[PDB]
Design a protein around this ligand. Structure first.
Ligand code: NAD
Ligand code: ZN
Lengths: 87, 113
């Protein structure tokens, strides 16, 4: 999943992808931060992902969801929610 | 004010955790753990060679869920990045007491060690 996601993000987006390589796991994280939101999208090679969007003013999460998927289409629809959640 | 958690981790993380007696921060920025500690909760997706380690952390360093897992609040967690921005004390990775290996992932199945 990770490699086609990397390519999708590179093609449709300006967000910077960070790759984490560990002995047992590959993962991708996308950190974004601006005036109103501190946010991160994490996706793992085990077909799961995490969507975090914290509202700076209130200090409460706007989006805080862990998702297990099984399809690249499912991943994109989840990431779409995360994207829409910022701007 | 202590709580028992479980985490499937690789040899390198376990070694670091044991050498420092401190929870290792995931390279994702947030270390996830099972709460309550459960060997089967996240064993299915744990890779071969992983070890299921149970340890005790302070309750104040956990953010639990209704789905059997919890976040450990470290410097690079979302809560940690908020604290930095607001000018509040940035939370460090908590201590890990009573570190015990309770399982291993071998040949695609959850072994109990
Ligand atoms: N690991 C668990 O037992 C656990 C607990 C509850 C939920 N989950 C869920 O499982 C999925 C994957 O989580 P995860 O914990 O496997 O991801 P992770 O990225 O935190 O860890 C993946 C692998 O990388 C290793 N690793 C990560 N950071 C490291 C570092 N700094 N130094 C050394 N080794 C390091 C870990 O030991 C593990 O083998 C997520 O959806 C998560 O919510 C995991
Ligand atoms: Zn397209």
């Amino acid at each position: 999943m990770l490699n086609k996601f990397k390519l999708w993000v590179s093609k449709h987006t300006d967000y910077t992808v960070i790759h984490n390589e560990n002995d047992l796991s590959y993962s991708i994280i996308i950190d974004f931060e601006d005036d109103r939101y501190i946010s991160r999208f994490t996706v793992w090679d085990d077909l799961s992902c995490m969507s975090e969007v914290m509202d700076v003013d209130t200090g409460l999460y706007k989006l805080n969801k862990r998702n297990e998927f099984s399809t690249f289409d499912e991943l994109l629809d989840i990431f779409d929610d995360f994207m829409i959640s910022i701007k | 004010m202590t709580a028992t958690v479980g985490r499937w981790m690789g040899p390198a993380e376990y070694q670091q955790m044991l050498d420092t007696g401190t929870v290792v921060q995931s390279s994702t920025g947030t270390t996830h753990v099972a709460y309550p500690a459960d060997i089967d909760a996240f064993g299915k997706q744990a890779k071969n060679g992983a070890m299921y380690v149970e340890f005790d952390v302070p309750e104040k360093s956990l953010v639990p869920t209704n789905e059997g897992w919890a976040k450990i609040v470290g410097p690079d967690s979302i809560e940690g990045r908020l604290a930095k921005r607001k000018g509040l004390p940035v939370p460090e990775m908590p201590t890990a007491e009573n570190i015990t290996v309770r399982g291993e992932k071998i040949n695609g199945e959850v072994e109990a060690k």
